Amino acid sequence: MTKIYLLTAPFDEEAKTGDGQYAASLELGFAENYEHIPCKWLKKDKGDYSIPFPTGTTSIPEETIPSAIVLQPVANENTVISGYKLKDTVSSPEKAQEVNNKTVSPRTPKIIVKHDNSLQSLTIMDIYSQKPIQFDESKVDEIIHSLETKKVNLEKAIEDNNAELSKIKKQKSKLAYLTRLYKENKENIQDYCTLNEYIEAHLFNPKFLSRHEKALNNFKALKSQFTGPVNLKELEKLTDKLTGIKEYSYDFHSNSLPYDLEHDKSFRNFYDFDGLKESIESIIKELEVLNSIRLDIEKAIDAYTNVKNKLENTQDIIANKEGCRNKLISELQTLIANKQEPYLSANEKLGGFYSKRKLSASEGFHLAYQANRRDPIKPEVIENIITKMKPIDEDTHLDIHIRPPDCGVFITPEDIKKFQEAGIKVNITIHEYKQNYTRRYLQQYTHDLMRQANSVQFFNAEDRENAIIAATYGDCDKRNTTEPTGVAKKIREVGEDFDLDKYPVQKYDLKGKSGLTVASQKLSTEPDHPLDVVAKAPNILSFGTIRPGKGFEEALKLAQLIKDNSLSIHEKIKRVPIVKLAGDPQDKALMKQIVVERFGKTAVKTYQKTHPYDNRFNNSQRRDYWKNLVRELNAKVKEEVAVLNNPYIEIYPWCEPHELLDLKQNCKYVCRMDDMGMRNNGSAIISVLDVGVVYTKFGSVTDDIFIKGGKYGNAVDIGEYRYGKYSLLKKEKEFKELPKWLIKNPDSAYKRQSESRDPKDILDSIVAREENQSDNYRTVVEAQKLLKERFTLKNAVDHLLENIGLGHLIA
């Protein structure tokens, strides 16, 4: 019959963060409410799925796939290195090498190390040739020897030609002599160097010597990694200096020195344009011969013959004539990067590097994604999963939780198709979509995930609407679409004449599969009556680890602003509010600024010193140092030895659970303004709705029902404008009292700012609420109704059943 299987592999299988907590709450809601629906989530700890490994080789990270856990660090413009280890003296390091040959990306270098933790093989892929390049120690030694032989041969050629090269005075005349003499192998020099290096060595020796020394030093550093233990901190920089992300000093496709041809001024006139023309003519002749006997030949012929016509006039390339060189460089780079026939069989007659290009985040992440999808051993762990999801009936559903790229990396469109081919309805749950607006490659990845899925389940309405807009209009970015609400966004932000980055996705019916869900949770103590919450010591409260950007600094500024205008606050309300802070001390600076206000600046020294703070304390003494500090002071003050500067702030670092309950019962106002704000998936705000009035951040994931007229409009005080003070609508309003707000910085990070709301406005709103004895009772009752009717396990399970088409089973 009906059988629901949850899957959040491999992230948060122990239920510690939001994703695992949500999955556990959903499973508990299924178990408690529907005892006839066998719902359970697959875990690696249980006998559900095991990490796929080759016959005698284990992944370098423990119990991870070396191509799936790399998506998360790659998406942040960071290159990390993973791979395999034979774990034994002899393990046939070949099959694992295949896993390193198909799952290799320029941002994801692959390694194979021996049993004694010594590097054996290094497979990388340059951003220009886009081909997997193994770098075994023998190959590195061969490359170094080839470079040395080329250097000595070129030195011999220079010392031989110096007798006649001095007679020629014109530099241009020397170009012809070297080119003609290079055509004849006096001592078999054509098999060691290329035509560019012959002229460069003779005429521009310091530049050629510098380039050769740079390449030789890079390769020597690469060779040095095979001597002792392998460390995954210097190989990343080596890969960056090898692939070309940060530096490209050697062209592995042609085994020759690279030439930028754009940032190589004073040498553009000496480039082997004639040699490139001959190579392209040979490629054209080969294509003509192949076509006479006869994937696409005509398209390749047209693409290659275009480059030949662009090099007919040499002067048109050295001097940029209506972008002639740029188009030529782009076409050459596109042709070289082609790995399909007949380009692959013809690219060996010309170099693989023609200009230095910057690997964008989108291109790098897409290459890593394709490498991950090309995994030959990944589908195995799918089969094991299927091996546990048997028998398969017509009422078997799979709920895959996706948080690009954290929660979902073991699931791919091929994986989803394999799941559906066995008779499983895949329901992809989007934990965050609008969050990755600055990184739209993750948006493309999750869009493919929804497209291949049977059903889609979103948490909020704004991200769901944005995803629907992207799916039904082609591009992830609504600015580059024809939608009336998206075309106006481009004009007001960057104008209608801006070449924004394109993130094309295939169109699909996302509205007919999408749905809505909530982050359910279970609370032990029932919330108090709203009448008791209004007159409940209106003090500002905030939990959580004290980190930069968690709203703790804003609470400190709130307390400070209370201190200066305490008299203004007084004579207007019964009691002055007090900002109460509690949680894990993690930021030393934030904790220092918190404690200076608490009991003065001087008393923070007449302690810090005596008992000072070493920047080594782990989180068993970092916690038990601010506790001792706040216990020694606030007690030196009651021994009336000192005075609490700022009596309107109270700090309780690492408070006990009973102390936390006392703080919750003694505070009506909470400041739960995190980096994202109010949302249907954020449990950190859902767990605090029962305390009272909660001030949050007006984020982009607001469900449009908490603003001014929704079913829970007064439940939380998000604010007036979205994103706090960083709103573009507000900036437009103050300006008209119109420039491009997002100009010269597309995809700005203003939607994820820390201090979005101004402390002064928060204080003014807080005072304006308690002075009405606005209308906190309405806020408390609406928050309680939202907690009891929407943020419940049964509601989340019912939403999931409705989204997966099982609404007839809802009680």
Q: Kindly report the CATH number assigned to the domain that includes residue 420.
A: 3.40.50
* Closest by Cα among 213, 238, 252, 241 to 128: 252
Q: State the sign of the Cα–Cα–Cα–Cα dihedral 394, 399, 404, 405.
A: negative
Q: Give the angle 508-514-515 at the CA atoms, nearest 5°.
A: 175
Q: DSSP of 159-184, one letter per residue?
A: HHHHHHHTT---HHHHHHHHHHHHTS
Q: Note whether 176 and 266 are same-domain residues.
A: no
Q: Identify the residue whose tokens are 């739209």.
A: 440
How many folded domains does the chain comprise? 4
Same domain, 85 and 34: no
Task: Clarify whether residues 69 and 39 are in a common domain.
Answer: no
Are residue 8 and residue 138 in the same domain, yes or no?
no
Q: In the structure encoding, which two tokens stand for residue 694, read together? A: 């909660």
Phi, psi of 149 (to 5 degrees): -65, -40
Helix axes of 462-473 and 440-452: crossing angle, nearest 10 degrees:
80
Exposure of 428 by Cβ count < 10 A (0-12 exposed, 13-18 middle, 19+ buried)? buried
CA–CA distances in Å: residue 170 to residues 173, 222, 237: 5, 41, 43
Query: Given in angstroms, what resolution was this structure solved at?
Result: 3.1
Q: Is residue 509 part of a domain?
A: no
d(CA 690, CA 679): 16
Separation CA 253–CA 277 (nearest Å): 18
Cα(296)–Cα(302) distance, rounded to whole angstroms?
10
**Is 619 part of a structural domain of the chain?**
yes
Same domain, 19 and 62: no
One-letter amino acid of 721: Y
600 and 649 belong to one structural domain: yes
Main-chain dihedrals φ then ψ at residue 34, nearest 5 degrees: -110, 95
Q: Quick one: 509 exposed, middle or buried, by C-beta within 10 A (0-12, 13-18, 19+)?
A: exposed
Residues 636 and 772 in one domain: yes
Element (H, E) at 401: strand 396-402
Residues 92 and 154 in one domain: yes
Contact 455, 427 (CB under 8 A): yes
Are 85 and 42 in a shared domain? no
Residues 233 and 271 grouped into a single domain: no
Cα 93-96-97 angle, rounded to 5 deg: 75
Query: What ranges in 511-565 are assigned the alpha helix state H?
Result: 530-534, 552-564
Cβ(678)–Cβ(790) under 8 Å?
no
Do residues 592 and 741 share a domain? yes
Does any domain span residue 514? no
507 lies in some domain = no
Cβ–Cβ < 8 Å for 622, 585: yes
The DSSP H or E segment spanning 397 is strand 396-402
